[PDB]
């Protein structure tokens, strides 16, 4: 009985955008850039920042693909945005 | 339920020995019993062993591999394929931090009193009274394999204490072929 | 705070959950993703009520259907005898039903008894009889406990018409009682029936002929047709198990 | 220190900023003039799914022939948003703006009928309620399809049943080209919220 | 007046009896021999309560048991991918479960659903995970309705890690959440599931790998073992029938 | 999760059963007729320790010659239960049922005297209290031995002292065979509860 | 038993179902949006008798 | 003695509304809508053979009347391939 069409309920559905690998070799005060694209850096915003290029063939046709979270899916529908961006940074480790 | 056979010598004389708890010592004195059986299942481990243990109660007779002088359980008829625990009262125990669960099994049977015979004289030919001396059986099966790094033991010991509550004994006469007799271990293995 | 997502998190450090058969012990209260403001988007609760196993077992089941024809001189029309001097000349019956197995093995009830161990039940019986108004007769429906396991000198067979009619039963006349209802109580000396180990019957139901079918000295119309219905009453299924009776 | 891997639910905000709703409302008053807080209003809006939909004369065309692609494309809001959900309910509205560049007959007329979804024209009658327009005096054929359903909700997947909800059949006595815009009635909406699909962006050809 | 005997006799001339499923119409009230001053000579009611069909269906059932080993590079340990450009490179899963059939065909529940037609049920899921404290990892458990009947571009497979994690699910970390509970609601667009004609599944459960199993560069101990339990909730069995699903 | 090996004292019962005492009392009313709740009543009962104890005429026999074996056997309750305890106190009762198959003299009589435990007949007088019976008119010689002790409790082990508690001496003018049954007085009981010994069951000979 | 051929007016319904009007009104609210209870309204509607 | 029983069958189905097609165009190839147009079926079977002396007929006729209550109709358009058409029986069997 919840309204799943409100912007606050869609843009409030979180999604994973970064899975980085922090090795024992990673230097201090250097961004953790191993494991995923846009390593260590997190552009703050509702739009998308990451895309891959699918190149197929003469010629090579290139189309760019995006990996959007619900907030990004919604933002793509509009021209300008304004929001408070929330990030949950979890570490997969042991004790 | 457990007994060992001491076979000594021509011929080979076989006498069966029992390892009774006080509840069993008492029950041996009577013909029929009725009680709430309580079991404390402890695991000897560390903080680095983890696993899930399933203790489920199955009523009725037990699958047995019957011998000429003893009885024992058939482990092949107790696997999750032949013996699913989906319709059995059970308790799944996590070993991450805990080690212990006490389990009380009330009395359930189509009889008001069961027999106190047990394994006395129980074997391939004499097997009815044994089955009729118990309300059922618990089985302890791993839900999740034992998890242990190579810094600890690759095994743990599962210790089970047994006692009874809400006890009732019926007839002051045993059901046994012979009388109550205490095993006095001889000096050496040659004696009788 | 967030939607559609359970986030890994700590919780109380001793969790015991019980779901209707089984009991779970967990290190900490599990992280649970349930549905927000859930509602029932079906109409099944509006179509009928949900029937328990008991109700399912109280359902009448057709067991047998008999057709007695006049002038047949068969056991179905052979009248109850005054004396029984030898076991080679026993009382002849129309039909016999071993209970309660006869009902448990009928109507799909065994499927609802499976995975259980003990049962206390009363058996409810109903005959429905049809005979043209020009046909007459009378039958005696009686039940004998342990008739298949008791000595012959104590059986409802091997005794007299007077003894037979001394057993609990109902008169079934064709032009007075086109239907009779009988109730057989829990008959085991035990505290309950065992559905797994003790495949056994404790009471045998018999249909006897007091007077044979009386019709004109005709044909195909001088006959009577019966149908037997059975169900259970005062039921209790209590202890679950993983074992089954291959005999269902 | 105690050996443990736990979660304390630590949260932090980075600025001593004013109430976000204050700032947002001021920004709307100064640079938008409106506020979108729900996505159903976008289903109430009309958006184009085809600028040129050619028809053949005297032919009863079900609009499925078009929507079955216009839904997978993702250009309109009824399609873009459908990729976030699994159910829908309610009726739909279609508008047909005439773009016919030639005179086919002294009297051009457009007609719309009902039809069960996923049916063909040879599987349904032409009776029932209808709407007729004359593109020369009214080049906009506006029509609404109610939610005539055997089910309270309709999924966005394939089903075993067919004809369990209503749709639109379109007829014309001449060859017409039309701009098609659709939308939902005042009762249309979607169900489960699920994850997003991947989006397609700029495409380029490169003669490597 | 007399004992142990029903005597043929007249009665009311319009008798309607209803026994829990069936309705009898008889010419006259049947002659019934019941037991005088009957009592319950069993103890089953004292051993446990009688479990309804609903309760039987709320019983957790073991469905699967997985054993993921580190450094296997198998679909069970292959991590969720950022992009999906082709259907030849879909998102790999550990296990998949078609619901609700996966539960109805398990635990002896089909026997208690037999002879019924319609069902409204919520599926309750529980994972139990075990990993030594020296092993880490994270999984995402998500359900996708109509994933096997919807177009591929709309499947939880064939989309991105962000999309997958946008589906309803729970984080399952090894050292934070050794157990997770999930509830899947009634998923049919219909008013109830058809257990006889429409053999169909409406929601597919997936177990995804966010981060692969992380252990030392050892061996046989770097692994994680899971076990899945399933049962039903919010149940309604309403309309009986004589037909069955051969698929049980 | 927190690294620890602990004990939460989790307890579970497996059935929604009625009160166990209700069911137990009903079962007793229907199939026993009595209720045994303590094991001292069993020491108040008489049980056989020997069906044939032969005596020689004109001989003062201490009953230790018999009890020293009848206690290690474990056939009676005073012996079976002694293996659970380490102490005892109180007096004892013995009954001697005559089983003599021959006439030895015109007047057969049985006589019982006191004696310190573990003594011999050549170490004690025949004075003190006594009981005499005539097996022909009363073939049951019933006698009770009080707790005449230097100690408040008596152990079931060997001691350095001797004669610290009383026992029974038995005399007869003819060779008598008797069934011996013993028991405790209304004051006998045991002490510490300790563990059980192993029990002996069926024995078989096998000509391998 | 008495010889007769009569009619006792025995009536039976087969399910412990809710009020039919409740269910019907819910179904209309969810899948029709209207309710036709008379056939004169159909005479008030216009329907085609010839397209040419 | 009795001859009659009226039987009301409430509406039960996994659908809120069934189809009004029925047997229209129903055959080996077109059979789905027919099955989807009904909630089920009654079957009339003898529990006991018909009992009749040779003074009466060896058969009886079972007459079944049909009507509806608590009625609801949804769409004012038929589901049929063609329109509503009334069969006007021709004068002879040769006409069309």
């Amino acid at each position: 009985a919840v309204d799943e069409m409100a912007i606050g309920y869609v843009c409030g559905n979180p999604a994973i955008k970064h899975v980085l690998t922090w090795s024992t070799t990673d230097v201090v005060q250097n961004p953790i850039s191993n494991g995923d694209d846009w390593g260590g850096v997190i552009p703050v915003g509702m739009p998308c920042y990451s895309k891959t290029i699918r190149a197929v063939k003469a010629t090579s046709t290139k189309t760019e693909v995006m990996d959007p979270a619900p907030c990004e899916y919604v933002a793509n529908l509009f021209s300008y945005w304004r929001a408070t961006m929330c990030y949950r940074i979890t570490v997969v480790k042991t004790a | 339920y457990s007994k060992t056979i001491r076979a000594v010598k021509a011929t080979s004389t076989k006498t069966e020995v029992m390892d009774p708890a006080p509840c069993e010592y008492v029950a041996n004195l009577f013909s029929y019993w009725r009680a709430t059986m309580c079991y404390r299942i402890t695991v000897v481990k560390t903080a680095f062993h983890t696993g899930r243990l399933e203790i489920f109660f199955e009523p009725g007779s037990i699958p047995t591999v019957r011998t000429a002088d003893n009885l024992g359980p058939d482990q092949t008829q107790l696997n999750g394929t032949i013996a699913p625990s989906d319709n059995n009262y059970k308790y799944i125990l996590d070993l991450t931090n805990d080690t212990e669960v006490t389990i009380k099994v009330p009395y359930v049977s189509n009889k008001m009193f069961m027999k106190t015979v047990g394994i006395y004289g129980a074997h391939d030919e004499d097997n009815w009274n044994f089955d009729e001396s118990f309300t059922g059986f618990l089985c302890i099966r791993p839900i999740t394999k034992l998890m242990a790094p190579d810094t600890v033991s690759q095994k743990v010991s599962i210790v089970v204490w047994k006692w009874a509550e809400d006890v009732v004994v019926v007839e002051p006469k045993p059901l046994t072929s012979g009388p109550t007799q205490v095993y006095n271990p001889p000096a050496v293995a040659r004696d009788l | 705070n967030v939607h559609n997502t359970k986030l890994a998190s700590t919780s109380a450090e001793n969790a015991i959950e019980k779901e209707q058969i089984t009991t779970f012990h967990d290190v900490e209260t599990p992280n649970r993703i349930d549905t927000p403001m859930a509602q029932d988007t079906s109409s099944a609760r509006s179509m009928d009520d949900t029937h328990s196993i008991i109700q399912f077992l109280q359902r009448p089941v057709l067991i047998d259907n008999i057709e007695i024809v006049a002038g047949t001189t068969a056991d179905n029309n052979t009248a109850l005898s005054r004396y029984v001097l030898d076991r080679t000349n026993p009382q002849k019956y129309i039909k016999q039903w071993t209970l309660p197995s006869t009902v448990l093995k009928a109507g799909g009830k065994a499927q609802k008894l499976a995975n259980f161990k003990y049962l206390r039940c009363d058996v409810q019986v109903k005959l429905v009889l049809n005979a043209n108004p020009f046909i007459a007769g009378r039958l005696y429906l009686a039940y004998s406990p342990y008739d298949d396991k008791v000595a012959p000198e104590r059986r409802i067979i091997y005794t007299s018409r007077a003894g037979v009619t001394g057993y609990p039963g109902v008169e079934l006349d064709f032009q007075l009682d086109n239907s009779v209802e009988m109730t057989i109580p829990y008959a085991s000396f035990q505290e309950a029936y065992d559905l797994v180990s003790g495949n056994e019957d404790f009471v045998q139901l018999y249909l006897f002929t007091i007077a044979p079918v009386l019709g004109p000295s005709a044909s195909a119309n001088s006959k009577v047709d019966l149908s037997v219905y059975m169900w259970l009453d005062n039921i209790s299924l209590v202890i679950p198990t993983y074992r089954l009776n291959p005999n269902l | 220190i105690n050996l443990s891997n736990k979660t304390d639910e630590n949260t932090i905000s980075f600025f001593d900023s004013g109430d976000p709703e204050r700032m947002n409302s001021e920004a709307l008053m100064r640079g938008c003039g409106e506020q979108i807080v729900n996505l159903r209003p976008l289903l109430r809006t009309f958006r184009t799914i085809n600028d040129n939909w050619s028809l053949a004369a005297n032919t009863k065309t079900p609009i499925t022939d078009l929507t079955n692609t216009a839904d997978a494309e993702g250009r309109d809001y009824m399609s873009y948003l459908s990729f976030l959900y699994r159910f829908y309910r309610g009726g739909r509205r279609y508008k047909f703006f005439n773009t016919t560049p030639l005179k086919q007959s002294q009297t051009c007329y457009v007609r719309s009928f009902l039809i069960p979804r996923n049916y063909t024209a040879d599987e349904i009658n032409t009776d029932g309620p209808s709407h007729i327009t004359y593109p020369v005096i009214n080049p906009v054929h506006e029509v609404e399809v109610p939610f005539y359903s055997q089910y309270r909700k309709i999924p966005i997947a394939s089903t075993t049943d067919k004809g369990y909800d209503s749709s639109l059949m379109y007829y014309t006595n001449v060859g017409t080209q039309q701009i098609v815009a659709r939308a939902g009635n005042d009762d249309f909406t979607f169900g489960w919220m699920i994850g997003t699909p991947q989006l397609q962006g700029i495409t380029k050809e490169v003669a490597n």
Side-chain angles (χ1 to χ4, degrees), chain A, chain B, chain C, chain D:
Chain A
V2 67
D3 192 11
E4 293 87 3
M5 279 298 251
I7 304 176
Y9 184 89
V10 190
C11 305
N13 177 9
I16 279 162
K17 296 288 293 194
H18 295 272
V19 187
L20 294 173
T21 301
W22 182 15
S23 311
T24 49
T25 79
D26 289 345
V27 180
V28 291
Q29 288 219 296
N30 283 94
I32 299 155
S33 316
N34 295 317
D36 204 14
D37 290 347
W38 281 88
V41 188
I42 292 167
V44 169
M46 303 174 67
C48 295
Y49 52 88
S50 65
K51 86 196 171 180
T52 192
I53 314 305
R54 175 170 180 272
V56 64
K57 308 182 179 183
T59 183
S60 55
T61 305
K62 289 169 181 271
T63 178
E64 71 203 14
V65 191
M66 295 152 170
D67 55 285
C71 56
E72 300 178 6
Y73 202 75
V74 170
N76 189 294
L77 268 184
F78 304 88
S79 309
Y80 314 120
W81 66 272
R82 166 180 192 112
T84 293
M85 306 310 308
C86 309
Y87 296 87
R88 189 203 171 73
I89 296 166
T90 66
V91 183
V92 176
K93 63 172 201 90
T94 71
Chain B
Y1 52 88
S2 65
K3 86 196 171 180
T4 192
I5 314 305
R6 175 170 180 272
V8 64
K9 308 182 179 183
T11 183
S12 55
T13 305
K14 289 169 181 271
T15 178
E16 71 203 14
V17 191
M18 295 152 170
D19 55 285
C23 56
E24 300 178 6
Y25 202 75
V26 170
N28 189 294
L29 268 184
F30 304 88
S31 309
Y32 314 120
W33 66 272
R34 166 180 192 112
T36 293
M37 306 310 308
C38 309
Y39 296 87
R40 189 203 171 73
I41 296 166
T42 66
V43 183
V44 176
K45 63 172 201 90
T46 71
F48 316 92
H49 295 98
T50 68
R52 296 253 179 180
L53 215 58
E54 157 182 56
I55 299 93
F56 70 91
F57 177 78
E58 170 65 8
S61 59
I62 316 186
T64 47
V65 290
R66 321 177 160 156
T67 50
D69 54 8
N70 208 325
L71 289 169
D74 192 2
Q75 299 294 344
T76 66
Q77 311 304 323
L78 298 162
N79 50 313
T81 301
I82 293 169
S85 49
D86 303 329
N87 291 289
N88 298 77
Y89 275 99
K90 71 189 144 293
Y91 178 94
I92 298 97
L93 169 80
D94 204 335
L95 262 51
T96 312
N97 294 12
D98 200 6
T99 65
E100 178 265 330
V101 63
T102 294
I103 288 164
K104 318 207 175 199
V105 178
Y107 182 89
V108 302
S109 197
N110 51 355
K111 297 150 258 292
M112 296 199 307
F113 307 106
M114 315 307 289
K115 293 175 155 86
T116 57
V117 191
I119 200 76
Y120 189 104
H123 50 88
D124 48 350
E125 322 293 12
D126 184 15
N127 42 27
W128 176 256
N129 283 345
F130 173 84
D131 298 323
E132 277 285 309
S133 304
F134 300 101
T135 56
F137 64 97
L138 308 155
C139 199
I140 315 185
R141 313 192 298 194
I143 290 298
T144 288
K145 282 181 94 88
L146 180 66
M147 297 274 128
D150 317 298
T151 64
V152 292
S153 194
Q154 293 297 296
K155 64 193 199 177
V156 291
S157 291
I158 299 157
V159 176
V160 187
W161 300 73
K162 176 186 176 174
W163 72 97
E165 300 196 24
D166 289 345
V167 168
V168 158
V169 294
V170 178
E171 196 174 339
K173 180 186 170 72
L175 271 178
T176 56
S177 294
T180 56
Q181 194 171 353
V182 176
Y183 183 72
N184 301 330
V188 291
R190 311 274 60 73
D191 311 330
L192 280 76
Chain C
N1 47 357
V2 294
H3 307 305
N4 267 17
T5 307
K6 64 184 181 297
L7 296 173
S9 186
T10 62
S11 286
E13 207 184 354
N14 187 245
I16 310 295
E17 302 191 76
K18 162 85 175 91
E19 308 295 332
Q20 194 61 67
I21 321 173
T22 299
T23 309
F24 294 99
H25 162 259
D26 304 299
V27 191
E28 301 186 351
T29 310
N31 315 118
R32 181 70 270 165
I33 184 70
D34 295 325
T35 309
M37 292 177 72
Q39 40 187 13
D40 193 44
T41 72
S42 190
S43 71
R45 264 149 187 155
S46 290
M47 272 195 281
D48 202 325
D49 290 277
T50 304
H51 292 158
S52 57
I53 294 163
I54 289 171
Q55 295 183 37
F56 190 98
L57 299 173
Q58 295 170 349
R59 284 180 183 183
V61 168
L62 190 79
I63 309 290
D64 271 12
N65 172 23
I66 309 101
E67 174 64 43
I68 300 107
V69 191
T72 42
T73 54
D75 297 333
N76 68 1
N77 214 46
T78 308
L80 213 50
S81 193
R82 180 63 178 271
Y83 300 104
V84 176
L85 312 189
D86 296 325
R87 281 169 229 161
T88 45
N89 293 319
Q91 294 292 6
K92 286 150 192 173
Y93 52 84
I94 301 162
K95 278 273 187 317
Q96 187 185 333
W97 300 282
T98 72
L99 299 161
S101 72
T102 301
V103 191
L104 319 177
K105 297 189 286 193
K109 299 195 190 311
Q111 296 195 65
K112 271 71 184 176
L113 304 162
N115 312 134
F116 284 101
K117 176 66 172 175
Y118 296 125
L119 169 73
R120 292 183 96 157
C121 69
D122 289 356
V123 185
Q124 276 288 150
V125 181
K126 197 178 185 300
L127 312 178
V128 302
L129 181 146
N130 289 119
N132 49 339
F134 299 88
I135 291 285
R138 202 170 278 193
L139 311 176
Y140 198 64
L141 169 76
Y143 70 82
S144 184
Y146 303 87
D147 192 83
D148 57 308
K149 303 183 289 202
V150 73
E153 58 268 18
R154 305 175 165 270
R155 292 176 73 172
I156 195 176
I157 315 310
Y158 308 143
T159 182
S160 54
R161 186 176 64 202
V164 177
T165 54
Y167 280 70
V170 176
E171 294 177 355
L172 171 67
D173 61 356
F174 297 179
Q175 305 310 333
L176 291 169
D177 289 345
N178 67 292
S179 171
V180 296
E181 288 184 340
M182 157 174 279
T183 311
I184 303 107
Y186 174 79
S188 182
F189 61 99
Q190 310 170 124
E191 309 309 306
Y193 301 127
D194 193 330
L195 312 169
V196 187
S197 64
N199 187 357
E200 270 177 339
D201 290 316
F202 301 93
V203 63
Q204 306 275 308
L205 189 64
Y206 293 90
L207 185 62
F208 292 106
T209 302
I210 285 166
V213 174
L214 304 174
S217 297
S219 183
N221 293 121
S222 297
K223 74 202 204 204
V224 59
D225 203 321
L226 324 178
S227 295
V228 190
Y229 282 89
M230 271 177 203
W231 61 94
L232 308 176
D233 187 58
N234 206 341
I235 296 145
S236 178
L237 276 294
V238 290
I239 305 300
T241 176
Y242 75 80
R243 269 151 144 175
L244 301 163
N245 214 345
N247 284 267
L248 321 169
Chain D
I1 293 159
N2 167 62
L3 295 174
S4 77
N5 202 47
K6 64 172 183 174
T7 288
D8 299 275
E9 295 293 328
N10 300 125
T11 308
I12 188 65
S13 298
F14 281 167
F15 311 110
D16 175 66
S17 289
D19 180 15
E21 300 297 327
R22 268 201 298 234
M23 302 181 67
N24 283 1
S25 290
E26 299 272 10
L28 297 166
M29 285 297 178
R30 293 164 188 157
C32 186
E34 55 207 13
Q35 199 180 334
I36 308 161
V37 304
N38 187 307
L39 300 158
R40 272 185 208 94
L42 299 187
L43 310 178
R44 309 285 180 271
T45 65
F46 280 83
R47 290 274 182 285
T48 303
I49 67 190
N50 190 329
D51 290 319
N52 194 245
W53 188 42
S54 295
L55 291 199
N58 193 2
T59 309
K60 332 193 295 184
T61 304
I63 196 158
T64 49
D65 307 349
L66 178 70
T67 51
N68 280 352
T69 75
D71 289 345
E73 273 171 357
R75 184 203 163 170
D76 56 320
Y77 297 157
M78 301 186 71
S79 186
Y80 198 71
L81 298 175
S82 69
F83 282 95
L84 279 181
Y85 305 87
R86 282 288 198 258
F87 282 168
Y88 74 80
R89 84 197 285 266
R92 303 163 169 260
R93 291 161 168 166
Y94 305 84
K95 291 198 198 311
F96 306 83
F97 306 83
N98 206 46
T99 308
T100 318
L102 289 176
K103 197 272 204 173
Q104 270 89 14
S105 85
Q106 193 253 356
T107 310
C108 311
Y109 76 87
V110 171
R111 209 164 167 204
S112 72
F113 309 91
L114 280 169
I115 188 175
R117 259 189 65 235
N118 313 312
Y119 274 29
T120 49
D122 56 5
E123 273 186 348
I124 200 69
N125 62 89
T126 55
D127 296 306
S130 183
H131 183 222
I132 191 166
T133 51
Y134 291 84
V136 60
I137 55 161
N138 199 33
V140 184
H141 188 92
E142 316 183 43
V143 69
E144 179 180 357
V145 182
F147 194 52
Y148 287 137
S149 185
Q150 306 178 244
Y151 304 104
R152 66 184 69 193
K153 62 196 94 176
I154 304 303
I156 318 177
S158 57
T159 51
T160 321
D161 197 354
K162 213 177 66 170
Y164 49 92
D165 44 347
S166 60
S167 181
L168 196 82
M169 203 165 42
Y170 210 69
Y171 177 90
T172 309
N173 56 319
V174 299
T176 46
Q177 305 185 346
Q178 299 162 123
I179 298 157
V180 192
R182 68 172 175 179
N185 71 356
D186 188 74
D187 289 345
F188 182 91
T189 184
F190 288 114
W192 283 288
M193 207 180 62
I194 51 152
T196 64
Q198 294 166 125
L199 296 171
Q200 193 160 346
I202 275 176
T203 289
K204 306 194 294 188
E205 62 181 10
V206 161
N208 61 6

